Design a protein around this ligand. Sequence first.
Ligand SMILES: [Mg+2]
Lengths: 216, 214
Amino acid sequence: ELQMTQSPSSLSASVGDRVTITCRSSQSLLHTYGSPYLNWYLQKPGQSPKLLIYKVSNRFSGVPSRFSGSGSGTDFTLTISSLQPEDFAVYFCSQGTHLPYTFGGGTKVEIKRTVAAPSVFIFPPSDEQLKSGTASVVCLLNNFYPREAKVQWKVDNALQSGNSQESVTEQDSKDSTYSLSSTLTLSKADYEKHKVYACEVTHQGLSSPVTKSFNR
Amino acid sequence: EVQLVESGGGLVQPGGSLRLSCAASGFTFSNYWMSWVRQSPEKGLEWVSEIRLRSDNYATHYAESVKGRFTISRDNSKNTLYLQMNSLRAEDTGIYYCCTYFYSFSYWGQGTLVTVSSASTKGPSVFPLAPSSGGTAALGCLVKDYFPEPVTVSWNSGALTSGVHTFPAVLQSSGLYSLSSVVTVPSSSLGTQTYICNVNHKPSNTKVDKRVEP
Ligand SMILES: [Mg+2]
C-alpha cells in the first residue's frame, strides 16, 4: 500500500505566522492523468474531519485563501499564509490514487500566544460522594498558556504520588488558552483522617507557585 | 445542505455484531460512491469500506482487516448506507464515519462510537463542584463512574455557554470513566442566577439535571 507520512507531528506558531506541513508518499502518486489525487483534511477537536484541499492544490468550497496546497511525485505540502486561532486543528494528508485509501498520521497545529497564568480553584468532596464511601477532590486551572503545568497534591503537606488524574481541554478556538482539571481520589476513611488538602500549581504565568487549599 | 446522519453504534461484546446506518440528504445519493472511515487513537484514520453505483453493479471494496467480517451496502430508495459488522474485535473499537466519496472523502457524517468490550454499561453519578468565596467564581459538576463513553454536559439547558469547560474523560483504575464540567461566572450573580448542569449518558439512557449551590 501507499504509506503516507506527515511531518512535523505537531507544530506551534503564533497568529499571522506562515506554517508549512509536509506529506510524503511511499511511492510516487501518478501525475500522468493530471494533478495527483492527494487530499488535505482538517479535524477540529470533537468534530468530524472536513475536506480542506483536494487534487494537491484545489481548495474545497468555502475553504479560506490562506490554506494553499502544492507538491509533486512523492512530496506534497500544505501552507497557511497567516496562522489564526480558529485554524488550529489536526491536519491530515490522504491519497485517493489507489486502494486501500491511506491517511497520514496528522500534524497538530497549535497557536503560540503570550503567557497567561491560570486561575486556580479547589473543590472539596461532596457529602453525597462521601455517603458513597469515596472522596474526590478536584483542582481547576483555568485559561492558561503554555499548556505545560505542574499540579501537585498535598494532604497534610504529604506529597501524593499516583492517586490523582489530570485532564486538559484543547486550546480555546478564540483566546488560545488551556484549562486543566486534576482529581485527587481517596477513600472516605482516608479523607476523614486528615484535615488540610491543597493543590500547588507551578506555571510560567506565576512568578511563584500558587496553592489553593481547604480544611475538612 | 449535505446531511449524513449515522446511527447504530455502541457497546458490543467481542465476537458480536453491529449494523451501522447512515441516512443521507441534500444531494442525489445514488449518484455517488460512499465509504466508511474509522478513527482510533492507536491507528488514527483508517478507510474501512467502499460501495460504488448501480452503474458499477454496486462494486464494493474493503480494507484487508475487515474483509469477510464487514459488509457495506446501499439502498438508494431509502437514501441510506449500511455497514454490517460481525466478529467484532477490540481493534475494531473507534469512531466510525460515513462519507460521500468523489476523488476524496468530501463530506463526513457526525460519527458513531463503537466500543468492543465485555464490560457492562453503567450510568453516572453527578455531584456538584460547589463554589466558595474574587470577581469571578467557578462552579461545576463531577460526572463519575460511567461506561461506555460518551456523556454530554450542558448548562442551564444550553442557555449558559460562556466560559464553560467540559474536560475530556479519564479512564480510572476501575474500567469506569470520570468527567468534570466547570463554568466561571460573576460572583455577584451567584445570588441572582441559578446554575444547573444537564448530564446525558445516552449509552445508559441517563439524564440528570443537578443544581449546583454554594
Ligand atoms: Mg502552543
